[PDB]
């Protein structure tokens, strides 16, 4: 069908490659594609260069190499391996005394590799490394919260690469300094740098205010290396101040570019800040015997001139996006790498001075393990290594572009206040202002703007067109926050003739404040409106008619779009629906021009013009992280002639290459008898019929059989006491047959473990004595299916040991996995949502004979309730229906660009053109106006929707253009007293389905120390009845109902057992005894030497342990 566009904004550049922040980053840290000679001292390299060479014997670093992975991407996904490359590093040992030369290339472990789309595989599950936001290295000044006229200065390096330092000028005239929270007069330190009384006034010499106060010659009466020892006493209360130990402590804190690194960023920021070039990323130097300061006096220069009033000395806004910055994934891991390397260096020098100082190689002086472990750590338990979000393909892409303020190096939740979370001015077009989570993480976790990129220093920059005179150049440049603030910048949509600014008032920002300014004064212009919002946010049509607090829900809620087996792109799109399917790298495209050779549910082979015969195989029915079938379907036919970059298969939730998050449905917006109540939703049974909102889901069910101190566990088809009917789907070995139907209770894999020292006790040895079978020695431990689960066995994997290629964790014989599937029709309880924040649960499925319907027999699919819209303030979904009405009868889809879309006239135009089809079809097919359509028109006139005294066609026309139609209740035939809004909406099925959340337990597992029930659906939980629930019962005064909760229903082991016996015996439950968890409270106070004591009214103890702990 036709795809009508709107939008006047000729966007100059396109969206940049949407995973570059994940991929570009790691590669600029590995360099596994650069000839070592040609490498450059960033990333994996720079870490080697830093830790090496090791010192007294000496061991120096030549070069590293990386080998290809021992198993291909998919092989690791299956075998729960990691997709990693072997890391070799060539070294040369050389003897500090003779001239020794040995040179091995010792193996360091495996560095894990990043796939094409930006993900990782770590023990066979995809994961994402969320870039982290943090205050950036550099030197800042910010007023003192106490003394309104004195200002702390602060000096901050990269995380854990040096200490913080403040220069608060005290109330006693002379300037202080804090290191490890240890304050002392700054002067003492300047001395140690070889500084002289005069060359201070020779450099300060203006502010006799304090320049003359900074000086106090109880210090000046000392040479440089004299105060050197003076201060080692000030920070080491106890250590012998030897002139070998003090030069080592200071240096190891302030001039040692090995545990003091300002950022590569930190250099430039402090450079331009204090306007001085900076040799290296380090506060001080050791050069020609003594210390030569680099950063302390410049900083001391700024601070003083500020506390008087000098120009060009502004406090700094640490929440500006020039003073914050992003630790991308590559940087984040070389950090962890630079910590494994340094640990290995504690392990060489240790064996460099004990064990034999001449019969030594690199090979046996290096224990690879301290490195191997810090890498295994970063990827398997960082806050920033998260299980991938591959619900649908948007979820994986949105993930890779996440930004956490939290994590190792940043903010502890408690450390997070307001300024961190606020939307800052400088977010504009770098971090989305919508896309962030509701809840406690609001404003810490955010999303990368769509046009935005991170420069080599870790700052986010956004594009802008350069205007000269008043004409707009096609030359685009990306600015950091800081330089942006220098210009007057016109708005995305300031109107143009050709490429000249055609207005006389132009809408522009100067340092983020809005200013009205003439086209003479205009230096740059936004590239687009798409540049201010997330990717997801740019998927919201009619965004400018949507209050922000629901734009946000429609933004996040998309990444929860279950992929539907008949998915379709939204009738009203925003223009990104295509790139997203692209960069998501989930659909499957054409590498060069060619013709198509074969085509099949399983593979797509294409002859190219190069004669090459590529064979793209199809990822068909692959189980995602979240259980959602990640299914690749083919979109070409034999011999199809394909130009480059055309499509060859749709990924999941993609239709002919467009992001198909849900379905387009005929929606009526009208209360419906209570099933609309509070966002609930009513749906037409005609939806399950045509398999709309259906989805396929999978769960892995895994089991091990392990060697035991009582025998081996056995995967058998031979389970004691089990009827063949109860096995009629298991193969010889004990596996369900691929293609069975399995439901709750069903065995999926039979298994036998040996019984214990409770091998049949008397009670039991006798019961068998009567039945002619003696006690059996093995046990049914079969893997059944959980309550409320099941489906159709689609595969099985059986890994023993003793088979090739395979070796499992120690003591385990064999491990069997059975993947089960289900086709999930929509059902009453599942969650639906639209891109505007309308979210609700399916509360009712009427049969089509009850659905409101149009005169011409057609029933609606969804009855939303108008009470959602007013207080919610998200009007877009209103327009999205109206333009959906038109589209429905013209047979068109539309592309309405965000903030530059189709406006009300353009669209009421399209409704007229539809009316013609819907009604003119009629008054010719032999039918006129209908008797009920008048009774409604009568009402519409009292309302004011229609002009009185006009032909019904004239009026129905008029209602239509208001997007309203006549609707007959299917329960009566009588019309809805009013004219209703009916149109076409994009509505996704969310991931939260009743099937995954119904749960109930009578009695189940309990906890070791508390004997209170376990928690969680998967453990077969109990429901936590908390302090607040207890209050509830308390306020009611339901003493017996509460007590029940606190004894027989939780951990009153005696009366608990006693009760369940009472029910199955048809008796009332018995009055309870003391909860077991209280006993634990007694015993735990004894272990602290406190003698707690239950007592009767006459003050004599009472044994709540029934004598079992008295002698």
């Amino acid at each position: 069908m036709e795809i009508k566009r709107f939008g006047r904004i000729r966007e100059v550049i396109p969206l940049p490659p949407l995973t570059e922040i994940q991929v570009e980053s790691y590669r600029r840290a590995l360099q596994a594609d650069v000839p070592p000679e040609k490498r450059e001292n960033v990333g994996i390299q720079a870490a080697f260069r830093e830790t090496f060479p090791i010192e007294e014997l000496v061991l120096d670093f030549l070069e590293y190499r990386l080998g290809e992975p021992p198993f291909p991407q998919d092989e690791c996904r299956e075998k729960d391996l990691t997709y990693q490359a072997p890391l070799y590093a060539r070294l040369q040992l050389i003897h500090k005394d003779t001239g020794l030369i040995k040179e091995d290339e010792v193996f360091l472990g495996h560095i894990p590799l990043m796939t094409e789309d930006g993900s990782f595989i770590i023990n066979g599950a995809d994961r994402v490394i969320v870039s982290q936001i943090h205050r950036s290295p550099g030197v800042y000044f910010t007023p003192d919260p106490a003394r309104p006229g004195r200002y702390i200065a602060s000096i901050i390096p990269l995380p854990k690469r040096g200490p913080w330092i403040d220069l608060e000028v005290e109330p006693n005239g002379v300037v202080s300094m804090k290191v490890n929270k240890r304050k002392f007069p700054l002067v003492l330190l300047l001395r140690v740098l070889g500084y002289d009384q005069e060359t201070l006034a020779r450099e300060l010499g203006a502010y006799g205010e304090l320049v003359q106060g900074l000086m106090d010659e109880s210090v000046f009466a000392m040479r440089p290396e004299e105060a050197l020892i003076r201060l080692f006493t000030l920070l080491r209360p106890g250590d012998p101040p030897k002139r070998d130990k003090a030069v080592a402590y200071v240096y190891g804190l302030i001039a040692d570019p090995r545990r003091y690194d300002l950022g590569e960023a930190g250099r430039y920021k402090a450079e331009e800040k204090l306007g001085i070039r900076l040799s290296g990323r380090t506060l001080a130097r050791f050069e020609d015997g003594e210390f030569k300061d680099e950063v302390f006096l410049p900083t001391l220069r700024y601070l003083f001139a500020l506390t008087a009033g000098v120009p060009g000395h502004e406090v700094d806004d640490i929440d500006h996006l020039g003073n914050r910055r992003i630790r991308t994934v590559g940087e984040l891991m070389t950090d962890q790498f630079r910590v494994g390397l340094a640990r290995l260096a504690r392990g060489v020098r240790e064996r460099m001075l004990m064990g034999s100082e001449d019969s030594l190689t690199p090979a046996k002086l290096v224990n690879s393990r301290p490195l191997e472990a810090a890498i295994r750590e970063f990827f398997s338990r960082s806050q920033l290594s998260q299980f991938k979000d591959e619900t649908n393909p948007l979820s994986s892409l949105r993930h890779k572009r996440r930004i956490s303020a939290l994590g190792p190096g940043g903010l502890t939740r408690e450390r997070a206040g307001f300024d961190v979370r606020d939307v800052h001015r400088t977010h504009y077009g770098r971090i989305c202002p919508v896309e962030t989570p509701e809840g406690a993480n609001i404003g810490l976790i955010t999303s990368l703007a769509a046009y935005a990129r991170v420069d080599e220093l870790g700052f986010i920059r956004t594009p802008y067109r350069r205007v000269v005179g008043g004409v707009v150049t096609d030359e685009v440049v990306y600015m950091t926050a800081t330089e942006e603030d220098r210009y007057t910048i016109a708005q995305a949509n300031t109107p143009l003739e050709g490429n000249r600014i055609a207005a006389e008032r132009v809408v522009a920002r100067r340092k983020g404040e809005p200013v009205i300014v003439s086209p003479e004064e205009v230096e740059f212009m936004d590239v687009s409106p798409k540049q201010v919002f997330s990717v997801n946010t740019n998927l919201i049509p009619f965004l400018e008619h949507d209050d922000a607090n629901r734009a946000l829900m429609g933004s996040n809620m998309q990444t929860q779009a279950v992929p539907l087996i008949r998915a379709q792109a939204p009738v009203v799109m925003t223009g990104l629906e295509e790139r997203v399917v692209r960069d998501s790298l989930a659909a499957l495209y054409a590498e060069e021009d060619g013709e198509v050779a074969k085509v099949d549910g399983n593979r797509i082979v294409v002859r190219y013009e190069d004669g090459r015969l590529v064979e793209y195989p199809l990822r068909r029915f692959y189980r995602s992280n979240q259980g959602t079938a990640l299914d690749q379907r083919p979109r070409v036919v034999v011999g199809q002639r394909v130009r480059k970059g055309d499509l060859l298969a749709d990924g999941p939730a993609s239709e002919n290459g467009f992001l198909a998050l849900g379905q387009n449905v005929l929606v009526a917006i009208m209360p419906f008898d209570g099933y609309n109540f509070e966002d609930a939703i009513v749906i037409s049974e005609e939806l399950l019929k045509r398999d709309f909102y259906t989805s396929i889901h999978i769960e892995r069910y895994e089991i091990e059989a392990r060697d035991t101190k009582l025998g081996p566990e056995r995967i058998t088809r031979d389970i004691p006491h089990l009827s063949e009917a109860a096995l009629r789907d298991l193969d010889e070995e004990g596996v369900v047959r691929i293609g069975a139907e399995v439901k709750p209770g069903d065995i999926l894999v039979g298994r036998t473990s040996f019984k214990g020292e409770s091998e049949p006790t008397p009670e039991e040895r006798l019961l068998r004595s009567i039945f002619g079978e003696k006690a059996r020695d093995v046990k049914d431990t079969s893997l059944r299916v959980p309550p409320g689960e099941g489906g159709i066995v689609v595969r099985t994997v059986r890994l023993r040991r003793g088979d090739p290629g395979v070796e499992l964790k120690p003591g385990v014989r064999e491990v069997v996995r059975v993947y089960v599937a289900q086709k999930r029709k929509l059902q009453v309880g599942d969650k639906l949502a639209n891109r505007h924040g309308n979210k609700g649960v399916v509360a009712k499925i009427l049969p089509v004979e009850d659905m409101p319907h149009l005169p011409d027999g057609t029933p609606v699919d969804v009855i939303l309730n108008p009470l959602g819209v007013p207080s919610r303030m998200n009007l877009g979904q209103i327009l999205e229906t109206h333009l959906g009405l038109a589209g429905y009868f013209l047979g068109q889809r539309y592309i309405s660009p965000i903030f530059d879309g189709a406006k009300e006239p353009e669209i009421k135009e399209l409704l007229a053109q539809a009316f013609e089809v819907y009604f003119g079809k009629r008054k010719g097919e032999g039918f006129g106006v209908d008797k009920r359509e008048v009774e409604v028109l009568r009402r519409a006139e009292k309302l004011g929707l229609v002009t009185p005294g006009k032909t019904p066609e004239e009026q129905l026309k008029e209602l239509f253009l208001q997007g309203k139609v006549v609707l007959y209740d299917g329960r009566t035939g009588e019309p809805i007293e009013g004219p209703i809004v009916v149109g076409q909406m994009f509505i996704m099925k969310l991931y939260h389905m009743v099937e995954d959340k119904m749960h109930a337990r009578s009695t189940g597992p309990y906890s070791l120390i508390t004997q209170q029930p376990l928690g969680g659906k998967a453990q077969f939980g109990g429901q936590r009845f908390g302090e607040m629930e207890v209050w509830a019962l308390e306020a009611y005064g339901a003493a017996h109902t509460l007590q029940e909760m606190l004894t027989l229903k939780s951990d009153d082991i005696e009366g608990r057992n006693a009760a369940y016996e009472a029910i199955i015996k048809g008796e009332d439950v018995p009055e309870p005894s003391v909860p077991e968890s209280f006993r634990v409270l007694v015993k735990e106070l004894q272990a602290l030497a406190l003698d707690v004591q239950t007592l009767d009214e006459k003050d004599n103890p009472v044994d709540i342990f029934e004598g079992l702990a008295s002698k």
Binding site: E704, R706, T708, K709, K809, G811, V812, L1008, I1009, V1080, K1083, E1084, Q1086, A1087, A1089
Partner: protein
């Protein structure tokens, strides 16, 4: 100020007097141990502890 802290202190004396505890008892010779089951050693599924 003297009258104030001889109250604070005295409170603690009568705390001991009225109860019958001996001040010395805030120093254990015999530290007690908490029953094993309340601090268990268990084999999880994989035969691990």
């Amino acid at each position: 100020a003297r009258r104030a802290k001889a109250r604070k202190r005295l409170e603690v004396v009568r705390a001991f007097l009225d109860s019958g505890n001996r001040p010395e008892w805030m120093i254990l010779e015999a530290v007690p141990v908490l029953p094993p089951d309340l601090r268990p050693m268990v084999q999880v599924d994989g035969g691990r502890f």
